[PDB]
Amino acid sequence: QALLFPLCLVLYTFSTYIGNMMIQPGMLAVVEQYQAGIDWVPTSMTAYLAGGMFLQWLLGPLSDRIGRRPVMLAGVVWFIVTCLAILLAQNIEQFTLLRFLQGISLCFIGAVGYAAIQESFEEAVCIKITALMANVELIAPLLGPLVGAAWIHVLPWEGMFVLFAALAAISFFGLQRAMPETATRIGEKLSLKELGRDYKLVLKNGRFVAGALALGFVSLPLLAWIAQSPIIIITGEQLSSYEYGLLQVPIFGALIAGNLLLARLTSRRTVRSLIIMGGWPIMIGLLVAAAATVISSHAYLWMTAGLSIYAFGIGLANAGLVRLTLFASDMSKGTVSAAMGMLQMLIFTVGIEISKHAWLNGGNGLFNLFNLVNGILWLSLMVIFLK
Ligand SMILES: O=C(N[C@H](CO)[C@H](O)c1ccc([N+](=O)[O-])cc1)C(Cl)Cl
Ligand SMILES: [Pr+3]
Ligand SMILES: [Pr+3]
């Protein structure tokens, strides 16, 4: 009778995710409205993700000391305010700063929201909620760009931010009445020296770092495609909004297909064999995209096929590498999760920006060549990581 709590956390999580996914196709309308160059399109996502890594390391220990309730509720409010505030941005620089401020809201989901879930419910009921949250993460990158392309076809980009704020408001009120206080160290002081030392400690573990870096590198081509596909397809190939959306279907559908095969194979395959199994489509897909576009710069259908094959591999291999990276360090899971989360976002932010310059200077060929080296770096780390 009190399932309002995990339900409203799912709603909030969903809203921060479309806070990125719906926005990207709208970015072409944003830069036209500010009369800014196309180079600002991928940067919207870069700033959002950079904000997502800013406070990651702090919120867990802090909410443990002052309460999961006030910290979680504060994050929801912060998202509401920054979503509305971007309506007042006067140039693309100001717009990009607010994307960064919005992205900080991402830190509250894992470090305090999910921490509260694990502390409240039975381990059997905890699996049901976790699975549901995983479903949302899988559905957002498919539906997001589709709904976002449909939105700006009829409605202003500003309207999307009003929608994000509204969904988060509903989420606030449910959390305000249903979230219990579960923080275990209320009243205790926080030492930033002890906290910083815990992070130096996790980063000393070479096998943990290899796994965490590998997760960043291997996912980068997907994230770069989310960031840049509007300018690649619409301004680069001179195609329509409809085709932009159509090309998302084989890519994110393959990702889903990869995850469903994972579920069917899990009882009769170890984590290690699934990573190796995914490596074939990961490497072949990225090779196909690169070879085709070097031969012919405008072979965007070959590019899309290569990325779908690669995306299938990710669906099969990623969750297993997450699990193994998590247990590669014997330290507290709060510290480990936050560390691996920050390492992968560091790669995403820097990688998208490199990817942007690669595309601007050399087109689809360079875009896909850079994705290929990221695949090679994942593979290089797995030869070491797996033993
Ligand atoms: O895009 C992915 N998701 C992972 C983890 O969910 C990635 O770390 C990520 C996290 C948050 C995010 N966002 O809300 O902007 C995007 C990617 C795929 Cl690699 Cl599954
Ligand atoms: Pr310490
Ligand atoms: Pr400690």
Author numbering: 14 to 400
Task: Quote the original article.
The best diffracting crystals of E26T/D34M/A150E were obtained in the presence of chloramphenicol (Cm), an electroneutral substrate, at pH 8.0. The resulting structure of E26T/D34M/A150E has been refined to 2.0 Å resolution and revealed a transporter structure that is similar to that of Cm-bound MdfA variant Q131R22, with an rms deviation of 1.0 Å for 387 common Cα atoms. Q131R is a fortuitous single mutant that was identified during the crystallographic pursuit of ligand-bound MdfA, which likely represents the wild type transporter when protein-ligand interactions are analyzed. This structural similarity suggested that our E26T/D34M/A150E structure portrays the transporter in its inward-facing conformation and the triple mutation E26T/D34M/A150E did not perturb the protein structure to any significant degree. Located approximately halfway across the membrane bilayer, the bound Cm engages in a number of close-range interactions with the transporter. Specifically, the O4, O5 and CL1 atoms in Cm form direct H-bonds with the side-chains of A150E (OE1), Q357 (NE2) and S232 (OG), respectively. Moreover, the bound Cm makes van der Waals interactions with the side chains of L236 and F361. In addition, the nitrobenzene moiety of Cm appears to interact favorably with the side-chain phenol of Y30, since the electronegative nitryl group of Cm is 3.3 Å from the electropositive edge of the aromatic ring in Y30. Thus, given the pH (8.0) of the crystal solutions, our Cm-bound structure of E26T/D34M/A150E likely portrays a substrate-bound, deprotonated transporter. By contrast, the bound Cm is 3.0 Å from A150 in E26T/D34M/A150E at pH 8.0.
